[PDB]
Amino acid sequence: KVSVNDIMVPRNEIVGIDINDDWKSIVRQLTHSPHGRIVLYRDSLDDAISMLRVREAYRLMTEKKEFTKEIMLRAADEIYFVPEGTPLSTQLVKFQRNKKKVGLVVDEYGDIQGLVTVEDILEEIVG
């Protein structure tokens, strides 16, 4: 059967930010985000921390108080993790019940394989 593995964005192609970069570098990356959500991590995808809704960050950035790293991090949501090889069928449900919209595909070793989205699953199912 067709599985999550077939449609995920491969690990190498996941857009995220190393929260270790100097602040000006982090903001520059944030404002240049090619996607709606992006991964916050420390050093590499061996240490993914949270999923940040870019639109939310932008929104916070426009406000009166200085936008900070602390503010950014508390604005991100915990990552939703999907086992490797979960079938599209099963994931469709766990996402419907989840109302979550994005997941990181993960090994049994905790090793991120890719990124998957409900948009992605549906469009595949229907073609």
Ligand X SMILES: Nc1ncnc2c1ncn2[C@@H]1O[C@H](COP(=O)(O)O)[C@@H](O)[C@H]1O
Only segment of 35-43, 69-77, 80-88, 104-112 that touches ligand X (CB under 6 A): 35-43
Considering only residues 75 through 104, tell me which ones interact with ligand X, judged by CB under 6 A. Answer: none
Q: Which residues contact 28 (CB under 8 A, 6 or more apart)?
A: none
Q: Rule CB under 6 A: is residue 9 a binding residue for ligand X?
A: yes
- Contact call for residue 117 and ligand X (CB under 6 A): yes
Cβ contacts of 127 within 8 Å, gap of 6 or more? none
Distance CA 116, CA 81 (A): 10
Q: How far is the CB of 102 from ligand X (least distance, A)?
A: 6
User: Among 21-29, 82-90, 103-111, 117-125, which window interacts with ligand X (CB under 6 A)?
Assistant: 117-125
Indicate which single residue of 30, 72, 120, 121 sits in contact with ligand X (rule: CB under 6 A).
120
Minimum CB distance to ligand X smaller for 65 or for 100: 100
- Going by the DSSP 8-state scheme, the letter that residue 79 receives in this structure is P
Report the distance separating Cα 116 and Cα 98, nearest Å: 14
- Angle at Cα 66 formed by Cα 65 and Cα 68, nearest 5°? 120
